[model samples]
Target: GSSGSSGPVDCSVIVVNKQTKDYAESVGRKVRDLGMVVDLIFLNTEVSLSQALEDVSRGGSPFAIVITQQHQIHRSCTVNIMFGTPQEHRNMPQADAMVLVARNYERYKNECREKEREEIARQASGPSSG
Candidate 1:
């Protein structure tokens, strides 16, 4: 298997009592299939998750991708897979939950961009104070 890039595509998987390493592996496989090299970090504790995020953030890996169980998701958690640049998010699979979120986010971004363009066009053609 060819590693997508040298950049770190960090993936954080939260394996609570219900979720197992297998589940994390499955998600990891899906992510890898999408041509992203993954740094799969398994966390069994809140402290570990916090530490992982802190470490990754401090390290400043440009290609970092984070994935965690929904229950463990938090505001401080920075998930690059879904919330990073629009192109990166758009490259994700629509069928995947994370990808779906990315898709929705991109849709909103596009809408905002379109509205801004419309406003600019309107200003260009509409009655001017000048």
Candidate 2:
């Protein structure tokens, strides 16, 4: 079993309710357009926000966007950064949030590739190499 930084870094999980599903999907499209995977989670009354987030966390997505009626009126959403550095940004417009997500994924791709290169370098060296 892997401990961390293993899978789906290019994907995004989206948590939204029925009322927000349409708007959330719009954002999902934007993410997809960037060549990233999107998990659109439609939370019902039975599911709590914390529970949805817990599920997203386990799926190994580096980022998620939460849209609710609270911020819908202002045309913004909440951004949850799940890996490396965990931080939350709220009330960010779709354009801004989209950029942040894309940027994060770009960084993740570069860092993951770097680690893979390092891995190859290690295997190519002798056991005594520092």
Candidate 3:
């Protein structure tokens, strides 16, 4: 799991998209390529949505990215948010959600690696180098 911190992050994701399960899995593979874990949950039901909406209660941090051209996102569906309210299914599949998430994950992973390297360098150099 991941939190809002640059220290270190190693989280396993669970993607949820009914109509776009295949598409979502494609995205999951991309995320995994970036070195993070990923999963899937295509529950296409209101009860599932309601349960996912309450995911915020567990913690304030994000768990995974969500996208679907299926229906309007419920009002309380605020946490773990990557894209805005779900809309009716569209013929043209938009690369909006997956692309954005992949980029962000890569960026963050790169940044974290950089910071880790810097800290190591600092430690190796000794406090006198300051």
Candidate 4:
């Protein structure tokens, strides 16, 4: 049994419209293919856009990709960076969004890895002498 409530497994939360299910599925596939977990939240009669965004933000995902009619009409989506400097990448084509998201994911992972190395080095240098 794997309890994945914590750890370094990167995840992305996608909040989109139920009307745009096909587009969301395709985007989800691509996100999964990029080696990250995908959590899809849809806006429907039961779930409002604001509720969807709020719930997903609390999910601890490193990225949030929001696509609604506001985006579909323009063939774009908003990519929200949940790590480091928070920034909203607005109205970008899907392809460009994927590349940008992937780049940031890699940078975040690298930073964590380097920080771990520093911790290990410090522990090695400090003698317990027990």
Clash count for each candidate, listed in order shown: 0, 0, 0, 0
Comparing 3 and 4 on TM-score, the stronger one = 4
* TM-score, every prediction: 0.41, 0.75, 0.40, 0.71
Tell me the alpha-carbon RMSD of every candidate: 13.7, 7.5, 10.6, 7.4
- Model 1 per-residue lDDT tens digits across residues 43-91: 6554555476555545433233444454233311233432346334322
Over 4 Å off, model 1:
1-7, 10-19, 61-94, 98-130
Looking at candidate 2, the ten consecutive residues that score lowest on lDDT are 121-130
Error of 4 at 11 (Å): 4.9
Highest TM-score against the true fold, candidate:
2
- The digit string of per-residue lDDT tens for model 3 on 4-60 reads 222212222333556566656665565566556555545555456546435422322
Give each model's whole-structure lDDT.
Answer: 0.43, 0.70, 0.42, 0.65
Clashing pairs in 3: none
- Candidate 2 residue runs with Cα over 4 Å from true position: 1-13, 115-130
Which is better, 1 or 4, measured by lDDT?
4
Q: Which stretches in model 3 have alpha-carbon errors above 4 Å? A: 1-17, 46-50, 56-63, 70-130
Which candidate order results from sorting by TM-score in descending order?
2, 4, 1, 3
